[PDB]
Amino acid sequence: MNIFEMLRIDEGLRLKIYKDTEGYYTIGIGHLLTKSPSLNAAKSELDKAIGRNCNGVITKDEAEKLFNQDVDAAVRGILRNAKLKPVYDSLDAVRECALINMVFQMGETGVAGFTNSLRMLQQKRWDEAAVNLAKSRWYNQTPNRAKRVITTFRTGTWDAYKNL
Ligand SMILES: [Cl-]
Ligand SMILES: [Cl-]
Ligand SMILES: [K+]
């Protein structure tokens, strides 16, 4: 298991524009197009991202390419973030994926708001961090995914993603 497989499981894959759990236009593997409620806006954003007239639909290759770029950006974002980098550096390779997962989902800013949780992870207080992470809108809005990620932080293993 690796970050790609992990995110592919949590985001799924759709080749046509769809609305994500918050109602935002998305495509591919969780690639957010826009927060605007205009399908047209979303359609423009798509073409611009892909570089051709897609008319709302893309290929699997295209989805995967968007996917590589998005993981890359999440990582680069974590590294450029003064609150995130220290944490990520302190973490083992499995747990780092859990952090990348959150940033992919919520963005650099959102995660950086989990201040108390971030400190607990840095101190390696796994159970305490897991409880803290659960006291969030994120857990309440997407509990199954949040469970998987928190379990990953808690255990250092891929158990939560095995048998999926
Ligand atoms: Cl893009
Ligand atoms: Cl969920
Ligand atoms: K590390």
Short mmCIF file of C-alpha atoms and ligand atoms in Angstrom, two decimals:
data_model
loop_
_atom_site.label_atom_id
_atom_site.label_comp_id
_atom_site.label_asym_id
_atom_site.label_seq_id
_atom_site.Cartn_x
_atom_site.Cartn_y
_atom_site.Cartn_z
CA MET A 1 0.00 0.00 0.00
CA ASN A 2 1.07 3.55 -0.76
CA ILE A 3 -0.42 6.99 -0.88
CA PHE A 4 -1.81 6.53 -4.35
CA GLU A 5 -3.62 3.38 -3.59
CA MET A 6 -4.75 4.85 -0.32
CA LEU A 7 -6.19 7.97 -1.92
CA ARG A 8 -7.65 6.00 -4.80
CA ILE A 9 -9.63 4.02 -2.24
CA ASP A 10 -10.86 7.11 -0.31
CA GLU A 11 -11.73 9.26 -3.40
CA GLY A 12 -12.76 6.68 -5.94
CA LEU A 13 -12.55 7.40 -9.69
CA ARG A 14 -15.20 9.16 -11.91
CA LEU A 15 -14.59 10.23 -15.45
CA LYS A 16 -17.49 12.72 -15.63
CA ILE A 17 -17.93 15.88 -13.62
CA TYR A 18 -19.61 15.05 -10.27
CA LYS A 19 -20.39 16.85 -7.01
CA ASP A 20 -18.30 15.91 -4.04
CA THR A 21 -19.60 15.28 -0.53
CA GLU A 22 -19.80 19.11 0.04
CA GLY A 23 -21.58 19.65 -3.32
CA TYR A 24 -18.52 21.00 -5.20
CA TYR A 25 -17.79 20.13 -8.79
CA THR A 26 -15.08 17.52 -8.96
CA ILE A 27 -13.73 14.94 -11.44
CA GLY A 28 -11.16 12.16 -11.63
CA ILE A 29 -9.73 11.09 -8.37
CA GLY A 30 -11.13 13.79 -6.09
CA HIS A 31 -9.78 16.61 -8.18
CA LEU A 32 -11.76 19.68 -7.09
CA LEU A 33 -12.71 21.88 -10.05
CA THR A 34 -14.34 24.80 -8.32
CA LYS A 35 -16.38 25.90 -5.36
CA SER A 36 -18.63 27.95 -7.60
CA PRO A 37 -22.17 26.57 -8.25
CA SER A 38 -21.83 27.09 -12.08
CA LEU A 39 -21.40 23.90 -14.05
CA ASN A 40 -20.04 26.16 -16.73
CA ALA A 41 -17.42 27.50 -14.50
CA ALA A 42 -16.50 23.92 -13.67
CA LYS A 43 -16.41 23.07 -17.31
CA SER A 44 -14.04 25.89 -18.04
CA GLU A 45 -11.78 24.94 -15.17
CA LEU A 46 -11.68 21.41 -16.47
CA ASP A 47 -10.61 22.30 -20.02
CA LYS A 48 -8.02 24.67 -18.61
CA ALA A 49 -6.62 21.93 -16.37
CA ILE A 50 -6.47 19.33 -19.09
CA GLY A 51 -5.64 21.49 -22.00
CA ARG A 52 -8.40 20.67 -24.43
CA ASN A 53 -12.17 20.76 -24.87
CA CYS A 54 -13.45 18.02 -22.65
CA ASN A 55 -17.09 18.92 -22.46
CA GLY A 56 -17.24 17.54 -18.90
CA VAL A 57 -15.53 14.21 -19.52
CA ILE A 58 -11.93 12.94 -19.41
CA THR A 59 -9.96 9.81 -19.96
CA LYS A 60 -8.44 7.52 -17.31
CA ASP A 61 -4.97 8.58 -18.34
CA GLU A 62 -6.07 12.19 -17.87
CA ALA A 63 -7.56 11.40 -14.47
CA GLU A 64 -4.35 9.74 -13.42
CA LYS A 65 -2.29 12.61 -14.64
CA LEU A 66 -4.37 15.04 -12.60
CA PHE A 67 -3.94 12.63 -9.75
CA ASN A 68 -0.11 12.65 -9.91
CA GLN A 69 -0.09 16.44 -9.97
CA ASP A 70 -2.40 16.68 -6.97
CA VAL A 71 -0.37 14.33 -4.79
CA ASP A 72 2.73 16.14 -5.79
CA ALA A 73 1.20 19.49 -4.86
CA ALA A 74 -0.08 18.19 -1.51
CA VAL A 75 3.39 17.03 -0.65
CA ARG A 76 5.10 20.13 -1.79
CA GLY A 77 2.58 22.09 0.18
CA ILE A 78 3.24 20.22 3.35
CA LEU A 79 6.95 20.84 2.92
CA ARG A 80 6.57 24.55 2.41
CA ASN A 81 4.30 24.82 5.43
CA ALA A 82 5.97 25.85 8.67
CA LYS A 83 3.32 24.21 10.84
CA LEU A 84 3.10 21.06 8.71
CA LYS A 85 6.72 20.31 7.80
CA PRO A 86 7.89 19.62 11.34
CA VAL A 87 5.15 17.21 11.90
CA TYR A 88 5.56 15.39 8.66
CA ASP A 89 9.28 15.15 9.25
CA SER A 90 8.71 13.52 12.64
CA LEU A 91 6.41 10.88 11.25
CA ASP A 92 7.18 7.33 9.95
CA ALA A 93 6.36 6.54 6.31
CA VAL A 94 2.90 5.08 6.92
CA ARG A 95 1.74 7.87 9.14
CA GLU A 96 3.02 10.47 6.66
CA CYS A 97 0.48 9.17 4.23
CA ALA A 98 -2.27 9.84 6.70
CA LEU A 99 -1.16 13.48 6.81
CA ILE A 100 -0.99 13.74 3.08
CA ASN A 101 -4.52 12.30 2.92
CA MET A 102 -5.86 15.03 5.11
CA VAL A 103 -4.11 17.79 3.17
CA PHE A 104 -5.44 16.34 -0.13
CA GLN A 105 -8.92 16.43 1.30
CA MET A 106 -9.00 19.61 3.29
CA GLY A 107 -6.11 21.63 2.03
CA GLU A 108 -2.98 22.92 3.63
CA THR A 109 -4.75 25.63 5.57
CA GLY A 110 -7.49 23.36 6.97
CA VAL A 111 -5.04 20.80 8.33
CA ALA A 112 -2.76 23.46 9.77
CA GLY A 113 -5.86 24.30 11.95
CA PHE A 114 -5.65 20.97 13.74
CA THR A 115 -3.10 22.60 15.98
CA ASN A 116 -3.66 20.46 19.07
CA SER A 117 -3.79 17.30 17.09
CA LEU A 118 -0.60 18.27 15.24
CA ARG A 119 1.29 18.69 18.48
CA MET A 120 0.05 15.39 19.81
CA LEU A 121 1.12 13.63 16.65
CA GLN A 122 4.54 15.27 16.90
CA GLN A 123 4.88 13.95 20.49
CA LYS A 124 3.79 10.59 19.26
CA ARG A 125 0.82 10.40 21.64
CA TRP A 126 -1.21 8.24 19.16
CA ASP A 127 -4.31 7.48 21.13
CA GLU A 128 -4.59 10.99 22.44
CA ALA A 129 -4.21 12.43 18.97
CA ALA A 130 -6.86 10.10 17.57
CA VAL A 131 -9.38 11.25 20.11
CA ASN A 132 -8.56 14.84 19.35
CA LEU A 133 -8.77 14.35 15.64
CA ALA A 134 -12.23 12.93 16.07
CA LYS A 135 -13.55 16.11 17.72
CA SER A 136 -14.00 17.83 14.35
CA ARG A 137 -16.38 18.72 11.67
CA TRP A 138 -14.24 16.53 9.35
CA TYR A 139 -15.01 13.40 11.40
CA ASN A 140 -18.67 14.30 11.67
CA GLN A 141 -19.10 14.93 7.97
CA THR A 142 -17.11 11.99 6.59
CA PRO A 143 -16.76 9.58 9.43
CA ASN A 144 -15.85 6.46 7.47
CA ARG A 145 -13.01 8.07 5.72
CA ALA A 146 -11.98 9.97 8.85
CA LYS A 147 -11.97 6.65 10.75
CA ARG A 148 -9.58 5.10 8.28
CA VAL A 149 -7.19 7.98 8.43
CA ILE A 150 -7.24 8.28 12.21
CA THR A 151 -6.68 4.55 12.54
CA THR A 152 -3.71 4.92 10.33
CA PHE A 153 -2.27 7.66 12.57
CA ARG A 154 -3.08 5.59 15.64
CA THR A 155 -1.48 2.34 14.49
CA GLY A 156 1.29 3.05 12.01
CA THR A 157 -0.13 0.28 9.85
CA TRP A 158 -2.44 -0.13 6.81
CA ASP A 159 -4.99 -2.28 8.62
CA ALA A 160 -7.83 0.13 7.98
CA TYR A 161 -7.34 -0.12 4.30
CA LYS A 162 -6.94 -3.86 4.12
CA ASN A 163 -10.02 -5.80 3.13
CA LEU A 164 -11.43 -2.79 1.09
CL CL B 1 -4.59 21.91 -12.29
CL CL B 2 -16.67 8.86 4.69
K K B 3 9.61 11.48 8.23
#
